[PDB]
Paper text:
The SARS-CoV-2 spike protein binds the cellular receptor ACE2 and catalyzes membrane fusion. Conformational flexibility of the trimeric spike protein allows each of its receptor binding domains (RBDs) to exist in two major configurations: a “down” conformation that is thought to be less accessible to binding of most neutralizing antibodies (NAbs) and an “up” conformation that binds ACE2 and most NAbs to the RBD. Structures show that the nanobodies target two distinct epitopes on the SARS-CoV-2 spike protein.
(D and E) Crystal structure of SARS-CoV-2 spike RBD in complex with VHH V at 2.55 Å (D) and detailed interaction interface of RBD with VHH V (E). Although VHH V binds to a similar epitope as that bound by VHH U and W, it is oriented differently on the RBD. In this case, CDR3 is mainly involved in the binding, and no major changes in the overall RBD structure were observed upon VHH V binding. Molecular modeling of the VHH V–RBD interface revealed no differences to the crystallographic structure. ACE2 binding was indeed outcompeted by all neutralizing VHHs in a dose-dependent manner, with VHH V being slightly less potent than the others. Complexes of the spike trimer with VHH V alone contained two RBDs in the up conformation and one in the down conformation. VHH-induced fusion was particularly prominent for VHH U and W, resulting in fusion of all cells in the field of view, and was somewhat weaker for VHH E. VHH V barely induced fusion, whereas no fusion was observed in the presence of VHH Ty1.
Residue numbers in the entry:
A (entry chain A): 334 to 516, 522 to 525
B (entry chain H): 1 to 82, 82A, 82B, 82C, 83 to 100, 100A, 101 to 127, 133 to 213
C (entry chain C): 1 to 82, 82A, 82B, 82C, 83 to 100, 100A, 100B, 100C, ...
D (entry chain L): 1 to 213
The structure:
Amino acid sequence: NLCPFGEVFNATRFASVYAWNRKRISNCVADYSVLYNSASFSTFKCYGVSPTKLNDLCFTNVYADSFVIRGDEVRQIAPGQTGKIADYNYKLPDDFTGCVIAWNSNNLDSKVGGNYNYLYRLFRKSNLKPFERDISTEIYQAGSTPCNGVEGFNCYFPLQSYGFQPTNGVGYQPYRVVVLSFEATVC
Amino acid sequence: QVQLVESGGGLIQPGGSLRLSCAASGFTVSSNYMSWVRQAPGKGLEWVSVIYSGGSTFYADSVKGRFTISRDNSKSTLYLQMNSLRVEDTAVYYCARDFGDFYFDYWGQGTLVTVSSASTKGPSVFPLAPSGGTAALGCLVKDYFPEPVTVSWNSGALTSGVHTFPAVLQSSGLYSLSSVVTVPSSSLGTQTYICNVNHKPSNTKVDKKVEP
Amino acid sequence: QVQLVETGGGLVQPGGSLRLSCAASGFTFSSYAMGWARQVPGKGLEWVSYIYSDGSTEYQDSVKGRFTISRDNAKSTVYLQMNSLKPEDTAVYYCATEGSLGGWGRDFGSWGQGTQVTVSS
Amino acid sequence: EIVLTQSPGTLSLSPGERATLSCRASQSVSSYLAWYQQKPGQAPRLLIYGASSRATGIPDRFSGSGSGTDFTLTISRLEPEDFAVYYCQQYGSSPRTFGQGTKLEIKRTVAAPSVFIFPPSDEQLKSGTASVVCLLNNFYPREAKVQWKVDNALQSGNSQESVTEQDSKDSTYSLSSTLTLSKADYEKHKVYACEVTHQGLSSPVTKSFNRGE
Ligand SMILES: *[C@@H]1O[C@H](CO)[C@@H](O)[C@H](O)[C@H]1NC(C)=O
């Protein structure tokens, strides 16, 4: 049985980083060399294994996490990194074994007035643990007085929205990301 | 309200260290982004360092490897540890509350950090003696360190038409300054003109009479 | 911090060649890999060539044989020799570097401003 | 490295008029642009964020416009406290960088400088050094050219200027140019002269003295 990668990569809607998506991959066979040759995949870098030897291996269980960041934040989706995305949205462990894949999606995910559907968490009192998903919408208490569900002075919405216009630089453009985590399910 | 009070600035030698701190009131230091932004004398603004709410720290490349930003929530304090300092680093350093590593909505008052190889020296005062309808006279306050000095005319009596120029930093590493005042010509033999120079860091006090 | 400047773009008539160069700054260029990509207006950004620190290269199949990626560590520079150009190849070409050092494979971490190449008629 | 180029460098206006300051970016920063006011001797104050959004407690007459690489700050009816230095700052790309500033300056009629020249004092000559001082008093606009001539040799690379801030009452400037040189070099030459070029002067004005008179 061939593996449902088309369901992941070619999906119609993509999640925002703070609420990233996570699909299981099990009991399947997959050809990774076809993927590795895609012109779309600006980033296709593995940790532990090498993309070349992916077809000759197999893994106990595989996860495909997927989300949308902006081009110059793709470098945070890697072990040992820091930044808003790596700290507060999606965190890889230092011992990560898997692959990070990213392609530019300027035509699907940008919009001339701005595409405000994609969000990321700006504020959090402490960093995310590896593979943690925080989806809290609670007003962020930046001062000693509580916020009582109303944003204001020292009381911020924890989620900000990307602008995503197609005319900005490549670092500002939306990139779709898929993270394959490898632990016999998928060979 | 929000208040931010810096301290720790002063004078310091190239190669030396210096710790700035910023007392913060009105918000949770540990819950916010906070930055240090410096301004050199007569120049624009430069971002130096940031610390995130989660504790990640980032540095401008000119200071990275030498500056370290940190904080202490119990004390409501931000700190900037400055090692291996250079003349370049001479600036007013502002502590600033940072809205999400984007812009600075609340600034402190600044603490001045001057990096010099010079040492304390009191100024020498020399007369700038008058020589159209009005005559100009003054005093030249030369070769002093550190800043500042204060100049009066007739112990505060004469203030009208007085210009005390900002100090200039010369190759020496010492500062120089002028105070001038314009008077009617007819008043030159009539009236006495004494300038009063005060340089507290050397306890220098000088009352110089200026005559044609 | 990291700064990458592309030049060399311009007008070519079909069949002609074009040498693109990208100057690097702000990192030990010796240790990082390098890449060249291109964006067609309205189409997704696509990678064309990659070069590792080991000199190992990758060429994407749509530019196979015709392009040649190379590097001079002495001058922190990467080059892209475009022979046998077609109107399919007109785009804004970008130069890129790894984001971080670990790992195996292509990594377009930091981007240049880009230079335009246009195949004429 | 996004570079912000603010123009003009100096902006000269009267109370009541409207002011248009521009900031241009070396690459598009979308709408990630902010504006600051800095009054003399004070800290910067956030005026506007997100190109157009007014900060809390900022009055009505400050407005932000533009996007991408072109931005404008507009001040509709200047009160006298609005005469300060203004900065733009981008946060679309790292590292964050500021503009170099636009100074908002009270405008007045052109006024020509009064020129005075001061020889070194005998007291200072015994010190082993000599300072010649040239004073340009109460003039406007600020731009002034002082040029030292020692025995008609146009002298260069050993003078320091310093200028006052604009006068609160008559909005003029004053400026001092100091020519410093050894007692020996001072004694080498005879005629010491100061030539001033200013917009209020039909022709450059020269004030001179002969060493030892
Ligand atoms: C995704 O869609 C494109 C275009 O329809 C197709 O050529 C490609 O093979 C698909 N890839 C996967 C992994 O489904």
